[PDB]
């Protein structure tokens, strides 16, 4: 129906936290594809917001470089595991979440008690290993922001891992029309199609 169309030509799920999408936009007048491509790339890599854990509070810990009896990992290793947890949310504001568990077992992302505005992306993400029936309570803070940043957690909010675009000649020089392709990689907090619309 429309003269200028766009469509997802490939959408792939590499893993729970690696989404791929390729999109086409054609036909475009000469020069328009270059304008769209660079602006879209800069918006995808620099203007899309995400949400993740910003800090964690430990109950009976002297410093973040000590060890806890009953936990295979160290306190510093816990913070790194928390930093890699992928969250999704549309709202702003500093939220708080909770980890309140009793061992032994495997602490994963699905064990986080999340406020109703926040959701987990990958359940299987590993937080800690408990080798003893101990009590572990960890407070969490969560924010939605742009770019990147109790023990603070170095949050990298950007959900778009990478982006790419290509420009191809449509054909004979009727108006020197061009074809635009856009490739988007996300971390699963939003789909590549949603990232394209948000940008």
């Amino acid at each position: 129906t429309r003269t200028l169309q766009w469509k997802c030509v490939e959408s792939r799920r590499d893993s729970k936290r690696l989404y791929y999408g390729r999109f086409i936009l054609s036909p475009l007048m000469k020069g328009q594809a270059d304008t769209i491509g660079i602006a879209m790339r800069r918006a995808l890599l620099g203007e899309i917001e995400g949400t993740c854990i910003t800090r964690a509070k430990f109950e009976n810990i002297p410093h973040d470089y000590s060890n806890i009896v009953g936990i295979q990992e160290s306190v510093h290793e816990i913070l790194m595991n928390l930093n890699e947890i992928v969250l999704k949310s549309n709202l702003y504001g500093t939220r708080n979440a909770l980890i309140c568990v009793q061992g032994p077992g495997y602490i994963t992302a699905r064990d986080i008690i999340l406020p109703p505005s926040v959701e987990i992306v990958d359940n299987t993400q590993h937080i800690a290993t408990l080798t003893e029936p101990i009590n572990l309570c960890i407070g969490l803070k969560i924010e939605r922001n742009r770019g990147y940043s109790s023990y603070p957690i170095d949050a990298v909010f950007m959900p778009v891992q990478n982006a790419n675009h290509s420009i191809h000649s449509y054909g004979n020089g009727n108006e020197k029309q061009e074809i635009l392709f856009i490739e988007i990689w996300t971390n699963g907090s939003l789909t590549p199609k949603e990232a394209l619309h948000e940008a």
Partner: peptide, 17 residues
């Protein structure tokens, strides 16, 4: 500004079903 906006409106287009 208007020409830039017109370039990115198409990504928000939907199709009749």
């Amino acid at each position: 500004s208007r020409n830039l906006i017109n370039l990115f409106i198409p990504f928000l287009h939907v199709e009749e079903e």
